Structure 1
Amino acid sequence: RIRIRLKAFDHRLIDQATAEIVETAKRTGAQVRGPIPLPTRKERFTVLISPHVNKDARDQYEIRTHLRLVDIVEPTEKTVDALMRLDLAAGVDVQISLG
């Protein structure tokens, strides 16, 4: 089975990507597993915002890396190849893995 790991910072974008991938899968092949949402990584950062000194002065940023696990149960001839030409939107790191 083809496991697909979508990773992105924007959630909407990721969602869009996932849908597209599903569409790509579903026309060619059959029995797409589904878009399973894994836990989001909220990598936080604190920094001092003064140039020199003021330690209680701080900004707390974060990067929300979202995960989408799409799986394809039956890899056909037509389906797997379809993704080669079918590149997804920018800012979405995909990671296909058969078996």
Structure 2
Amino acid sequence: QRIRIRLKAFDHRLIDQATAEIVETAKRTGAQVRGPIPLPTRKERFTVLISPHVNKDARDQYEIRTHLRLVDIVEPTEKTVDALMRLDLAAGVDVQISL
């Protein structure tokens, strides 16, 4: 069928590096690959009072951006499956596979 990998991480330059790794590996190991597609970034936000007591207008405004990548692999050639499946990827990337 197909194997699709969802990649999410807080850092972009680092996420598409992990993406790049996977795609290339696939492309070299003679897999056919749809993607990588940029799936919309879900940015949480936080607003917190900046003073320990009172001064309600004094605040910090933080956000955590969560980046999303879809890697779609058309042919699951076993060499490809082994190629991918012991890649060494950035620790701070969460990798999901659909089967």
Task: Deviation per CA, 1:22-79: give whole Å up to 9, x if none.
Answer: 0111111332111000000110001001011111111110000000001001101111
1-structure distance, mates of 2:70, 2:84: 16
Inter-CA distance 18–76: structure 2 relative to 1 (3 Å threshold): same
Moved more, 28-37 or 50-59: 28-37
2-structure distance, mates of 1:25, 1:58: 47
Residue aligning to 2:90: 89
Deviation at 1:90, TM superposition (A): 2.0
8 Å CA contact 1:3–1:69 kept in 2: the answer is: yes
Moved over 3 A (4+): none
Deviation at 1:85, TM superposition (A): 1.7
Inter-CA distance 29–96: structure 2 relative to 1 (3 Å threshold): farther
2-structure distance, mates of 1:4, 1:29: 17
Deviation at 1:14, TM superposition (A): 0.5
2-structure distance, mates of 1:80, 1:97: 13
Residues matched between the structures, number: 98
Q: Which runs of 5+ in 1 are unaligned?
A: none
2-structure distance, mates of 1:75, 1:41: 30
2-structure distance, mates of 1:78, 1:38: 28
Deviation at 1:84, TM superposition (A): 2.4
Q: Normalising by the residue count of structure 1, what TM-score does the alignment of the two structures yield? A: 0.93
> Equivalent pairs: percent with the same residue?
100
CA RMSD of aligned residues (A): 1.0
Q: Which runs of 5+ in 2 are unaligned?
A: none
Q: Normalising by the residue count of structure 2, what TM-score does the alignment of the two structures yield? A: 0.93
